[PDB]
Amino acid sequence: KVYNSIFDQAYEIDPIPYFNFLRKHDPVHYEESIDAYFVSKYKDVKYILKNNDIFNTKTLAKRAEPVMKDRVLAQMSGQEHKSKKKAILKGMTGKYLENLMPILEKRTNDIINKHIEKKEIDIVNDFGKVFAVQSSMDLLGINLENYEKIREWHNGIAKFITSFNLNDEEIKYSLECSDKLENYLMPLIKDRKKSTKDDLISILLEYKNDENSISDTEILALSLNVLLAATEPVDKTLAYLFYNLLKNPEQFESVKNNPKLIKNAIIETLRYNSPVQLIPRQVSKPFIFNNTELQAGDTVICMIGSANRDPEAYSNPDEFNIHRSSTSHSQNLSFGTGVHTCVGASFSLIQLEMVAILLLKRLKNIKLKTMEITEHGIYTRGPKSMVISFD
Ligand code: HEM
Ligand SMILES: OB(O)c1cccnc1
DSSP: OOOOOTTSHHHHHOOHHHHHHHHHHOSEEEETTTTEEEEOOHHHHHHHHHOTTTEESTTSGGGTHHHHSSOOGGGOOHHHHHHHHHHHHHTTSHHHHHHHHHHHHHHHHHHHHHHGGGTEEEIIIIIIHHHHHHHHHHHHTOOGGGHHHHHHHHHHHHHHHSOSSOOHHHHHHHHHHHHHHHHHHHHHHHHHHHSOOSSHHHHHHHOOSSSOOOOHHHHHHHHHHHHHHHHHHHHHHHHHHHHHHHTSHHHHHHHHHOGGGHHHHHHHHHHHTOSBOEEEEEEOSOEEETTEEEOTTOEEEEEHHHHHTOTTTSSSTTSOOTTOOOOOOOOOOTTOOSTTOOTTHHHHHHHHHHHHHHHHHHSOSOEESOSSOOEEOSSBOEESOOEEEOO
């Protein structure tokens, strides 16, 4: 009946033509291979995410608990979700943020110093993948001894969450990584207990819910939740930001002339090349969009990239333009919206600005070497490589 499918080979290569087709001709599009409906329009994605009662987060456990061990923040609700989300935010705000940012500057400059004499650096593989995990470990309070293994294990677990129809051999690997990371972090939670340091794991340890703490297995799951979430989108967004700016030399010069424009450049990057592309929800009762009927138990999948390029929300939506301002403009859905909006949104914007400013400061006369990127992933999406040269 329908011949355009999310799982066509062409979609992962370039999904933009699919975004346009779906929004125009099938805004709630069924994919029988995973028995879910893909939602492409800004208005319907926002509606879904803003109504936690009709579209709930119970679709996560199946795609999480296997590798997470215990409950994840997204599966919580009520006063529990609010208070535990507030606890996590504490680890990237206030005094914790004042202490962390100088350390993230050290991580950034240490990486830069490793590549400066080669006169070129891969924003994805040389900087992004390394900085992202190290920053997430500093946020949690994990010493950087084993950042290599932590990277490997993180990849294996993320693969289980960001993939559809994994084969049995790929599943057992993701779990092995899940077991290894647990074996590593569990004794570290016990020590952070003996002598509490000023990090996120210590926050989770001292958290009181009616004078009742959370079991160490819940701390492990929440710590893993932060580790996976905070790492994945960093290398992607940094690569997209410098690539889009260098593909628009005039806007690159505007950022160099007004450093304050970098925040807007990051926001436009997140809209244009959304690193988190899909958000699933479970339908809790009969419902209808346009004339597509959904039943209790069905699965909807919000297409963040498509929504952020909806011409009903943005004028010239498929063009990168850091000068957007205010329907010709709307709030993008890169961090989601509603109850489960990204707890790390403010930190991410601050973290990403600090990194971009330092790269612009220390790498002079930046030139693009990767003239054409190849992007991979449909759940989380980024460039394979993004190499720049400098003096
Ligand atoms: C560019 C960076 C990031 C992007 C684009 C991003 C994107 C998102 C999105 C779209 C959601 C909504 C998920 C949903 O509704 O199911 C979300 C939620 C979440 N993100 Fe992020 N995120 C980023 C960085 C971070 C960081 C740095 C952290 C932690 C340090 C983090 C932790 C979380 C958590 C815990 C949630 C769940 C919130 C809840 O359920 O209440 N994210 N993120
Ligand atoms: O819900 B997610 O897939 C997610 C991924 C990366 C960062 N934050 C959230």
